[PDB]
Structures are given as structure tokens and as C-alpha cells.
Design an enzyme around this catalytic site. Sequence first.
Site, PDB file in Angstrom:
ATOM      1  N   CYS A   1      11.500   9.981 -15.165  1.00  0.00           N
ATOM      2  CA  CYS A   1      11.412  11.282 -15.920  1.00  0.00           C
ATOM      3  C   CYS A   1      12.107  12.399 -14.919  1.00  0.00           C
ATOM      4  O   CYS A   1      13.303  12.366 -15.136  1.00  0.00           O
ATOM      5  CB  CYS A   1       9.851  11.516 -15.968  1.00  0.00           C
ATOM      6  SG  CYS A   1       9.347  12.889 -17.145  1.00  0.00           S
TER       7      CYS A   1
ATOM      8  N   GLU B   1       0.919  -1.161  -0.102  1.00  0.00           N
ATOM      9  CA  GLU B   1      -0.035   0.102   0.071  1.00  0.00           C
ATOM     10  C   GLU B   1       0.922   1.187   0.005  1.00  0.00           C
ATOM     11  O   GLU B   1       2.165   1.056   0.244  1.00  0.00           O
ATOM     12  CB  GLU B   1      -0.858   0.020   1.178  1.00  0.00           C
ATOM     13  CG  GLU B   1      -1.797   1.151   1.324  1.00  0.00           C
ATOM     14  CD  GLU B   1      -2.926   1.197   0.146  1.00  0.00           C
ATOM     15  OE1 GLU B   1      -3.823   0.523   0.129  1.00  0.00           O
ATOM     16  OE2 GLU B   1      -2.692   2.415  -0.342  1.00  0.00           O
TER      17      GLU B   1
HETATM   18 ZN   LIG Z   1      -5.129   0.667  -1.595  1.00  0.00          ZN
END
Ligand SMILES: [Zn+2]
Lengths: 278, 278
Positions: A181, A87
Site C-alpha cells: 500500500c 516472531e
Molecule cells: Zn508471538
Amino acid sequence: TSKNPQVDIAEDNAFFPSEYSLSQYTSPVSDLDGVDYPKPYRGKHKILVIAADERYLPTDNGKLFSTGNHPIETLLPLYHLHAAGFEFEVATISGLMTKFEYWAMPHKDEKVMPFFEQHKSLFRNPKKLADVVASLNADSEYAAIFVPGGHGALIGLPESQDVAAALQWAIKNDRFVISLCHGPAAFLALRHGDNPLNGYSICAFPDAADKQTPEIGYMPGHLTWYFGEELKKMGMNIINDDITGRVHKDRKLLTGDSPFAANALGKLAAQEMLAAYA
Amino acid sequence: TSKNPQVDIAEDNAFFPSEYSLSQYTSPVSDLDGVDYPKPYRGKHKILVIAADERYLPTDNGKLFSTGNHPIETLLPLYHLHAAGFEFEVATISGLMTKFEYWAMPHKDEKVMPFFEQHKSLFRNPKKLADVVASLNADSEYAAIFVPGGHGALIGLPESQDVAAALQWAIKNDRFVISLCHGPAAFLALRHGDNPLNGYSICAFPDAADKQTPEIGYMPGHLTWYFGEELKKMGMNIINDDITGRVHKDRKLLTGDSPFAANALGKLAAQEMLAAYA
Ligand SMILES: [Zn+2]
Ligand SMILES: [Zn+2]
């Protein structure tokens, strides 16, 4: 398809990239794929994302480029990581909401959009980086620091003591550092101080390209400085001078050269991080 | 003229005020006048402006109001003060550029626009408030702190320790404090600490109005909280519950109720400040 920059009426003398630029560098659907992780990470470490809190970048002619964090660049690698079981949390220097380059948002992507929607609050109401840094210790639960690209990464990050402390913590504590980038411009935060990234190699958006894109109206003017050469002065090696969608690895420093490299960076990061945490 | 909020494509689900709102509350030319100061201040004290570094305000329905500092509110009083001999400096909490509500910019005002153009850099490249505060002492050369209105004043300022320290310095050091519309929401920075504004009276944009404007599409939704009642809980008195373009004085605390009060606040501030410094 015109090569003229487009007006962003929200700001004074600000422009979005030209139609041509958009038709050639964006798409309603991304190239997100290879999202197969049957044995996901099952720990507590999260990915700490350091995003852009400013959308407007001043160019050499006084005009402002309406930029921010690149959505493809930000979302694809987090999609892979989230899928891989990691997460994430979002932080900005000021604590103000994340600013995205919505003109590159794949609004029709049946996977990316819902993934974006389900985490929108993390981007909109981010933590203040300084607050995160104050709580950092060898046991801090962040498996990696992610600095997405987009020209907005050039604002603030390259001169933030908070970003420097953050990067210092990650490296010293053997954590992953991911970027692509223009995201690596934030590494310039380490100048004038302990620079644990000295001697590292990466790929990134080449200064050479930034000197050409305005010709096709991607930006309303030229950059006032180039992060490539500065990074080189800071003791870092940039392996590419063109854009191919490639990714590179130097220990736990994982990078990409453009949005075309986002999907690949996701796979690389997920693969590398899973192996380290399992 | 439609009462529907207008789209701000720069951001996700963000809107500018409706056409009706704009036709009734903005104008290509301001009501700037009474700029007569034959004997201007000739000292070094400057006006310290604390501006908004964020343009987007989240409403109760998840939609974002594309706001920021009100240009009429910001520029008119500074025009009077500058004319009266007081130059100004700009600061934002993050140090990011000032964000204006350009939909209220009097683009045809032959006085305000050039005045804006000649100071644009001060707004675009502001000082970081914390940096200003660190150098503050009884001799600091700021004759007043100006917190312009605009709904952007509701973001960050009301919870910034830097703003609190700033206001504390100004009051303790007998300096002027000027504000209008929603600018006084920044005074809420003083909660939880020494509150030198306790017992003060002011006029400002009434919460009652904020509960009505969305009916005419000035905002895409309702506010998530009201600064009026909070200020009252903080021990401050708000004398108006409507909008008349009025201004008020309580010692060196000078305020206005809306953009209609900007020209008047300029005169009042210039008059009051000249008399104090001469
Ligand atoms: Zn999540
Ligand atoms: Zn001036």
C-alpha cells in the site's frame, strides 16, 4: 450508505473514511488463510516492523484524515510470518505507540484478534528506531524489515534518517524488505544519500487511486503530495496503476498493492523467507 | 450527568473524561481577562513552548486516557504573553503535531478561539525540540520556556534528554521557565545529570488529586506513577496538596496548580517578563 467523511471528535477537523468507503473496503472478518507451515523456522532472526506513530494526516483543504497503519495490512503478513516461525519486534521513529486505523480492524476475526491481543504490548510500547539502528551490525538478528501500509506511513517515515539507515542495513546485509500500500513511501528516506533501492521494482497503492478515493469520502480531502512519482524520481519502478490485490517480488523486496494483497503477501513472504533460512 | 468515562473510538480501549467531569471542569468560554498591556515588549525574544506529541496515556488497568495538552492551560498564558508583546514558537520531541484535550476547548470563547485559529499552524507543524537545542547559545532569542499542562505532559517529556538540555539552557542563561498542572513533570528530565532546578519551589497538580479524579471518571483508570513524589526525590518542593487555582513564583520559575490557574499565570508571567525586559 453515505459517502460523507465521518467525524473523529478526538481531533480538530479530523475525519474517518465514509460509511460507503468502510462497507466496501473493510470487513469484521479478514480473508486470512493458507496458514500451513508444518516445518517452521527454528532460528533467532526476527522481523523488524517500522510502524506509524502518528494517526493524523493533513489534506489539501486543511482537514485531517484520521488514518495510521492499516490493521489488515499489518496483521495478516505478520500472522503468516509468526506462524512460519518468525516472531517480530516493533519500532517507531519517536518511540510513541503504534497508531492503527481501527475502522478497518476485523473485530470479529477469531484468529486475527487474538493474535493481535497477544502482541498488543509490542505495538503499544515500541522501540525507538534510532536505538535499534545504533546496535545494527552484519550479525544483527533481523531477517527482514516490514513497513506496513496505511496512510500513516506517509508521516515521518519518508524523511527519517533512521529509516534510511535501517533500509540501508537490510539491503547491504542481504535481508528481506517487505511492504505494501503506502508503506513503500518510507523508501523515500533514501533520497539525498546512498540509495541501494535504485533500480528496484515494486507494486504499491497507485497515486491514481489516491486522487479518486476522496470522491467516495475515504479521506476528507486530497493528498498534498504523491509518493508514487517521488519514488519514480528516486529511481524505482512501480508496476501497477490500479488495485487488484496483487503482490510482487524483486529479489528480497516483497510488496503488495493494498489490503486485498495482505494475505497473499504473507504467504509469499513466509514461503520466500522459509526457503532462505532453510 | 454520568460519571462514566466516554469512548474515544479513534483508539483501542481509550476514553475521554466523563460528562460529570466535563460539566464541572470545562466550559465553552474561559475566564480569560485582565489583558491590559498598554506598553508591550518590543524586542525579538520569543516564548518556546514544549508541547505534547502524544494524546494517549495508559492507565493502571490497561485502559488509555484520551488526553494531551490542556487547551485552557496552554492558550490563556500565551494569550496574555502574546498580548504583552511576546510571540511564541512550538516544539515537540518528535516534531509531530501538538495533541490537545479538545474536550476542554472553550469553543465559544470569542477571544481564545480566534487566537487559537491564528496560530494553529505553530501547533500543527511544530519544530523538533532537538533541532532547537542544537542551535542554543547564550544569545538564543527565547525569553522563556513554557511547558503547558494536561496529562499528555507525562508522556515522553519526563525522560527526554532534549527537554533536559532545554531546561538546563534556560536556567543557566537566566531565562524564565513557566509551567502548570502536570507540565512540571517534564522537569524530571533533569534526573541523572546536572539538575539546576534542585532546591526550587513550585505549585502543580497534586498527586493526591490524581488518585481521586478517576472516582468521578475523569480518567478510565489510575496513573501508573506520580510525578509529585518523583519531583520531590529530585530535590524540588511542591507547596500545595490541593487545587485552588493558585500560582507561585520562585525567581524566574513561574507555575500554576491547574486550569483554574491559567489566567492568573498569564498575568503573573506577563507582568514578571515585561518588568525584566523593560
Ligand atoms: Zn508471538
Ligand atoms: Zn501571533
